[PDB]
Design a protein around this nucleic acid. Sequence first.
DNA 1: TTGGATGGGAGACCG
DNA 2: CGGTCTCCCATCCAA
Length: 92
Amino acid sequence: MKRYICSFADCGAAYNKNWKLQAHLSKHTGEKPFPCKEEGCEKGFTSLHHLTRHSLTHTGEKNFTCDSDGCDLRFTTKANMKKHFNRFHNIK
DNA sequence: TTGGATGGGAGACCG
DNA sequence: CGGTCTCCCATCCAA
Ligand SMILES: [Zn+2]
Ligand SMILES: [Zn+2]
Ligand SMILES: [Zn+2]
């Protein structure tokens, strides 16, 4: 219930989830608390789990299978699967 | 045009 | 109340 409020008071932004507030604060601070560390791919995520879905790309865990016979295309994320599904089927 | 890939965000799961 | 996870968009990104 205790939404954590954005340091820059006037902004009036508030979120109980720390990750959310980090992602918010990143806009002002430029901070990215969840780095990937990996050489070259030294990415800076502002929230946990977004890092984990990114990790699907390192692990190669392509799995979000379009539920369409024959067109059983496997995508990296549910949203990518949805975009495809929309783009190719749910065009309406 | 397309699916791979990232910042941002409501909601689900767990405690 | 709050981290990890579930689920997703919009956008960026390389093909
Ligand atoms: Zn703010
Ligand atoms: Zn990485
Ligand atoms: Zn399809």
